[PDB]
Write a protein that binds this ligand. Structure first.
Ligand code: L2P
Ligand code: L2P
Ligand code: L2P
Ligand code: L2P
Ligand code: L2P
Ligand code: L2P
Ligand code: RET
Ligand code: RET
Ligand code: RET
Ligand code: MYS
Ligand code: MYS
Ligand code: MYS
Ligand code: C14
Ligand code: C14
Ligand code: C14
Ligand code: TRD
Ligand code: TRD
Ligand code: TRD
Ligand code: UND
Ligand code: UND
Ligand code: UND
Ligand code: UND
Ligand code: D10
Ligand code: D10
Ligand code: D10
Ligand code: DD9
Ligand code: DD9
Ligand code: DD9
Ligand code: OCT
Ligand code: OCT
Ligand code: OCT
Ligand code: OCT
Ligand code: OCT
Ligand code: OCT
Ligand code: OCT
Ligand code: OCT
Ligand code: OCT
Lengths: 231, 231, 231
């Protein structure tokens, strides 16, 4: 395990996701409100899935070698397995907060699936120049998602409770900033142009992942917006 | 890319799915009705997914070699990845049109999953005679789906709005004819008996795919059946 | 096929799932009640999926070799493909019976996904001692599911119809006993410590699978709890 310099960040990531999972699990024990239960379920599952995939990367299972540029390049494929399930759960948290219509939710989840799926294909593609074609398609799917979060959701939040409108606005802003960093790190890291070494890349993704999951969850689950308006 | 004679049909397929995706995306921009949004979301996602998988076939990612009959046989596995997601979306379009009950929808999607999954296993099976066992099981799942579309849905459409009944009937008929061709092409093509060469097989699937997705979508999204009855 | 001593149990399993599938399919033909249709759909799909995966194991497709302990160890990976889809369907049968809230259903299905997914990783892991780390995480996800079935569902059933409360209690008890055997068989069988040989392991899983699917389904589909209260 320690044979890879990036192991320290995989281990820290595993620990922080594990701790985040346990914290949300305990916190949600005292919850009976049916609406709050939905948000706790979604939000606890996110770091639990990430915990398993960080562990698989730490132990070496979630790593494969991909030939491109005349080299055997270490590619952590387990990231995409994580993201396939956790990024639509994160979007679902946002969509339920603002009572999004079903068509909009399906558009978001579908675009998200395309985003992660094409990122996976790009990560595993052996023809170097083609990796960036997949990156571009994935990034276009991301831009669609960000567009919807701003010009379909923000003006939906404003007709809702003030506490859900303010909580949505904060989580929207956190999401757009954090999620936009992922394609940049991929592009300059070992999957793309290879300018930033894998150990630093792994650190960067770990900070983004913990912030986008445990950070996000801490903000959401401390808000009164997750509860039905009750006396 | 041009090293494979079937590349021209993969390229045309990619282009037509891409163009179809953009057309539906633009067309649905001016839509606020919650019901119509569902149909636009579902129907736009279908060629978008197909676009990505056609591209993966064009670039060579979605192709593998399978030993059977003492030969290395080129198998485009990306078709099944496409179909796994797009065929239940197509069925969902039909089921929502007639306000199908939840049990019926689950039966359809489940049978569809079995249909595509067993087709994939058959496509990748190395014992030649066993490929046709999987083809038979998949075809039985197809026949179940077609049965339900006729003797569970058609008489559901007739108690609904005339515009939804007439639109459903047309899309049902398009679906049954087009979908029934797929097992025949598989059986006589490079996956099955090998009587029709891969380049012609690829052409045939491209015509079926564009018709079943973009053709289907053009009929559906031009109907007033996708809108709630409103003043 | 007969080259593997466990083939007889794979063949019997295939037959019993096939027969169970046909029986439930015929039985549900005379059903119009929308609630009952849901239970028939879910419950018929379960042995149908299991039939396909038992067949893939019989024909040899669903088997791979995994190096650990200095040996090539036969691992039937198709079990996890089965279980990935059938165990959440089984939980859905239980959850719908007691009209579980959406948050609880998502927690169950999510924990179940983690349970099966980590079992799959453990089954395919090449470092022997690490296989048991994945077994432990999977078992913890199982224990969560069993906890919810007892201390979240049982007291939900009691405020419902007596026929649904009594049917739920029986199916809950069947589920907890049968499902708890699976991690034990894995641990002592060819995936784990290797004390029980593969042919006996295969027998054990076949008895558990038929009981947990066809047995379970026979109890559920003969109950009046699956019908809406109607005059
Ligand atoms: C009911 O609605 C609220 C339940 O949501 C909360 C439900 C949770 C989503 C349940 C899912 C967590 C499972 C219990 C997962 C089990 C293994 C976990 C990964 C635990 C890992 C952390 C520990 C090992 C440090
Ligand atoms: C509604 C939304 C969910 C829409 C989803 C959007 C989605 C369509 C976007 C594209 C997804 C698609 C790229 C998934 C591809 C998975 C694939 C990378 C798995 C690895 O297999 C690739 C090659 C080795 O590189 O296998 C070597 C050759 C092997 C023989 C491969 C044969 C097995 C195939 C992988 C079977 C395909 C199954 C499905 C792709 C399962 C989807 C997995 C998940 C990653 C989407
Ligand atoms: C809101 O409900 C309506 C939105 O549906 C319409 C929503 C669409 C389903 C959004 C999904 C499309 C994504 C934007 C996919 C991005 C890449 C596409 C494959 C674009 C490819 C076509 C172009 C490259 C020729
Ligand atoms: C409700 C509905 C959805 C019901 C669904 C119906 C469904 C049950 C029908 C059968 C689906 C099942 C056949 C999927 C099999 C996928 C498999 C072909 C992927 C390729 O792996 C096959 C061999 C190489 O040929 O791998 C070589 C050996 C490797 C070590 C394989 C180990 C990895 C396994 C593939 C893990 C299994 C994961 C699940 C099958 C994911 C499902 C993928 C999708 C195609 C259904
Ligand atoms: C409508 O709601 C009730 C339908 O549920 C019942 C619907 C069923 C879930 C339909 C799914 C079964 C498909 C017809 C599967 C076809 C192949 C089967 C595996 C048949 C195998 C058994 C036989 C070959 C012995
Ligand atoms: C809401 C709930 C559903 C939550 C779900 C919980 C879930 C997160 C729990 C963990 C699931 C995760 C372990 C699935 C891993 C599948 C993996 C074993 C498939 C086989 O690939 C493993 C190695 C060979 O051993 O591939 C060799 C290297 C290859 C290059 C691998 C590259 C292809 C990757 C497999 C692509 C990943 C796609 C997704 C994992 C699809 C999920 C399949 C299913 C088994 C969950
Ligand atoms: C918890 C993990 C999260 C929130 C991950 C988010 C990841 C993305 C938004 C990834 C986006 C990518 C692209 C837009 C193109 C390049 C490849 C990706 C997959 C890194
Ligand atoms: C957009 C793509 C569509 C509508 C594809 C439909 C495909 C089928 C109905 C495929 C059916 C098959 C069988 C019935 C058995 C042989 C294998 C298949 C998968 C080709
Ligand atoms: C129809 C099949 C059923 C009901 C299978 C149930 C399987 C399980 C509950 C498996 C549990 C496992 C663990 C808890 C850890 C070890 C690995 C598994 C996957 C066997
Ligand atoms: C969105 C953030 C992307 C920028 C990442 C900056 C990383 C700077 C680290 C120094 C680069 C290491 C190069 C020498 C090894
Ligand atoms: C459902 C349509 C299946 C029939 C396809 C007919 C294809 C005819 C093309 C000629 C066959 C090529 C054989 C000589 C290369
Ligand atoms: C939950 C049941 C697990 C116990 C399984 C008992 C199997 C006993 C069979 C005898 C073991 C075979 C060892 C000699 C080959
Ligand atoms: C490819 C995996 C996509 C599914 C991820 C799980 C999250 C799905 C959330 C469903 C949202 C509800 C839509 C109506
Ligand atoms: C194996 C992939 C199956 C899922 C495909 C996505 C479409 C699912 C549509 C869900 C229909 C709603 C059922 C209640
Ligand atoms: C990884 C596969 C998980 C999906 C299995 C299919 C069963 C899903 C049942 C959905 C229950 C409804 C939740 C709201
Ligand atoms: C186009 C929608 C406006 C809100 C999205 C902001 C786009 C940020 C760009 C992210 C950088 C990705 C490379
Ligand atoms: C049995 C249901 C009647 C409607 C379905 C028509 C079946 C068409 C056969 C398709 C050919 C597949 C090989
Ligand atoms: C902790 C919840 C109480 C009900 C679950 C009973 C646990 C049975 C243990 C199963 C054995 C697995 C190794
Ligand atoms: C070796 C790099 C070749 C450049 C490929 C860039 C493709 C980016 C596509 C953006 C439309
Ligand atoms: C080499 C071909 C052997 C014939 C197999 C046909 C099987 C079809 C099954 C239909 C019930
Ligand atoms: C070779 C076996 C080494 C023992 C591993 C047991 C790990 C079990 C983890 C339970 C917390
Ligand atoms: C990680 C295993 C958890 C089993 C005990 C249940 C914890 C309490 C959860 C309350 C919903
Ligand atoms: C509760 C702490 C969980 C941390 C387990 C994984 C950390 C890796 C240590 C090497
Ligand atoms: C908008 C046109 C999209 C076409 C891109 C793929 C066509 C392949 C050209 C070689
Ligand atoms: C209807 C009987 C189904 C049995 C088919 C599979 C049994 C395997 C026989 C070798
Ligand atoms: C993006 C950083 C999130 C910070 C989380 C802090 C949570 C405290 C309530
Ligand atoms: C099956 C062929 C479909 C033809 C689509 C034409 C759409 C015009 C409205
Ligand atoms: C766990 C054993 C189940 C027994 C099923 C018998 C069904 C008869 C109604
Ligand atoms: C990591 C366990 C958290 C302890 C409880 C925190 C207050 C709910
Ligand atoms: C008003 C919300 C500001 C949140 C910005 C957080 C940036 C990481
Ligand atoms: C809305 C601001 C987006 C900031 C992008 C930051 C990418 C590192
Ligand atoms: C391909 C872009 C379509 C242009 C608009 C067509 C009329 C909505
Ligand atoms: C009355 C509907 C006829 C549609 C037939 C289309 C055949 C491709
Ligand atoms: C309902 C008519 C079906 C026609 C099947 C055509 C197969 C090529
Ligand atoms: C296996 C076929 C079952 C025959 C009908 C049983 C009574 C519904
Ligand atoms: C009162 C229900 C008892 C069911 C026990 C079944 C054990 C297999
Ligand atoms: C509730 C009793 C569980 C029995 C476990 C049996 C495991 C073989």
């Amino acid at each position: 395990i320690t044979g890879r310099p990036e192991w320290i960040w995989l281990a820290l990531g595993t620990a922080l996701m594990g701790l985040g999972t346990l914290y949300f699990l305990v916190k949600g024990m005292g919850v009976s409100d049916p609406d709050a239960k939905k948000f706790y379920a979604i939000t606890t599952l996110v770091p639990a899935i990430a915990f398993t995939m960080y562990l698989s990367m730490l132990l070496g299972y979630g790593l494969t070698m991909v030939p491109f540029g005349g080299e055997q390049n270490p590619i952590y494929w387990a990231r995409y397995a994580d993201w396939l399930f956790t990024t639509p759960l994160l979007l679902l948290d946002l969509a339920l907060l603002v009572d999004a219509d079903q068509g909009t939710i399906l558009a978001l989840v579908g675009a998200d699936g395309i985003m992660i799926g094409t990122g996976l294909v790009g990560a595993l593609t052996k023809v170097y120049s083609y990796r960036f074609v997949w990156w571009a398609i994935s990034t276009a799917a991301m831009l669609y998602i960000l567009y919807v979060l701003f010009f379909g959701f923000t003006s939906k939040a404003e007709s809702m409770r003030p506490e859900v409108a303010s909580t949505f606005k904060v989580l929207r802003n956190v999401t757009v900033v954090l999620w936009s960093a992922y394609p940049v790190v991929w592009l300059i890291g070992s999957e793309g142009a290879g300018i930033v070494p894998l150990n630093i890349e792994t650190l960067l993704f770990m900070v983004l992942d913990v912030s986008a999951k445990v950070g996000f969850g801490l903000i959401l689950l401390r808000s009164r917006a997750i509860f039905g308006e009750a006396e």
